[PDB]
């Protein structure tokens, strides 16, 4: 079989697994909470979801390690609350990818980041069986 290079976009962690269900998202959020970390939600439409070099035109010397759309837009006690917020974000922005992020409150660093929602309207991604043709 051949890995398809057409409409096969991916979003880093857990993006190569089948779309996670509510129970799986809940278990991941519980894992984040268990470690002592804070979960939050990021979202972006299809125009600002993938990495790009749009602003590299303004730079000189080098553009090493600079990529656009690394930041998404921010949307935290347990899995159920984060799941409710996931549904709320889905209703508010149906054409936007949702990403669950984790933040270590002591080190003040991001420790987690996995996609939990892919807009049905957008078709820039494949499915577990359509990834190979």
């Amino acid at each position: 079989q051949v890995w398809t290079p057409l409409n096969n976009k991916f979003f880093e962690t857990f993006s190569y697994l089948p779309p996670m269900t509510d129970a799986e998202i809940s278990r991941q959020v519980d894992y984040i909470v268990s470690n002592g970390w804070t979960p939050c939600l990021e979202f972006a439409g299809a125009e600002s979801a993938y990495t790009s070099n749009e602003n590299c035109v303004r730079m000189q010397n080098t553009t090493c390690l600079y990529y656009d759309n690394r930041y998404w837009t921010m949307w935290c006690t347990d899995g159920g609350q984060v799941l409710r917020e996931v549904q709320a974000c889905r209703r508010a922005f149906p054409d936007a990818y949702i990403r669950v992020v984790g933040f270590d409150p002591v080190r003040q660093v991001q420790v987690s980041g996995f996609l939990v929602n892919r807009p049905a309207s957008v078709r820039d991604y494949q499915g577990p069986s359509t990834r190979s043709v």
Partner: protein, 420 residues
Amino acid sequence: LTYYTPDYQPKDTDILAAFRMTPQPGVPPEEAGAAVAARYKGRCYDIEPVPGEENQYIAYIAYPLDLFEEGSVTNLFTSIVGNVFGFKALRALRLEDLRIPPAYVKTFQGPPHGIQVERDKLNKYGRGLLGCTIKPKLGLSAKNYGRAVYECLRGGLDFTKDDENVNSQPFMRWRDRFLFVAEAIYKSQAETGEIKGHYLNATAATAEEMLKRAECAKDLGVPIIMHDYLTGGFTANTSLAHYCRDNGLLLHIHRAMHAVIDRQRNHGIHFRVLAKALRLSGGDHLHSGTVVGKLEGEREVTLGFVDLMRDDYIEKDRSRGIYFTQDWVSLPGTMPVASGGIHVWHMPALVEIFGDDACLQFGGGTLGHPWGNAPGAAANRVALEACTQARNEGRDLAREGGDVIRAACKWSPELAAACE
């Protein structure tokens, strides 16, 4: 003995070494420790016999901080192990550990970015990184090398790397390879939407040539380069690490020629000291182990030097080979890179042993997947993500790795052709 002072209390600024030495018969251990030790004099303050080996002692030496040049791994190695392995009074001598006082650590820049800055720059969290060594090792043209890089990266791999002996040869000059690899990296980035990279080998004959190759990598905008620090030298490595910090480049470190110094148990320098010297000199990644069949070497020793090269504060643990408490005073950590034959069903073991802050390298070049390079990379990525997800759910990977692999294979056609 003016140089054996068992009542001496080491200062907070002393550099401490733990030597495993076997003196010649008739030489008392105190005399041998005094010799190794011999205001600016190194002194043996502690000697303990090794329980299990005949005529084997651990000698603890304290060096004043004024003895060394600030921020110079070269000087540190010249002072500590310059001419001490040639003493006739010692049948065998092995440096086991070093204690770098914070006062000395603060004089070093350290790794250019570290693990957390690397994760933030690459926007990859919660999982180990994946890499492949482009194979065949040599003979491939820059165009074909770039084609292989693009094929492996588009599958889902986060990194690819040049072979350790690929610097600049008649078959493939370095600038052609850099250009074709840059095109491949950018194509794979556009196709998958994830940030990709390739460990471009900057190891060269002269520091000027090495800096020129780093400069070309910086001008292409590519993320990361590679260096052979034990063959290029600490002086060349430190220059490259300073350059990478200045210009925002990641630095992968390969430990070529390491077994010539850290293989024999009785003679040489233990890899943990070389790992601490690398972290001081600078490196974002450091090839730290081989997985032939399984992770080779005592697990505790591996865990010890992985913690020594990763954490900020490592307490003394003789079980794992930590002879001294090591405070890193906020020096950036180095990401360990486990390479070799990482088979798909062996991923759960390595994910359990290393965790998320490591790079698993398929130095075998994969190619074992009947479909191609890209599906093989996808299978590996699927397996790693499935193992990580299972571990996050509370599963015991060492007991359910096969079950997790099978369950992932049930829905992954690419992994199905890999699991067979």
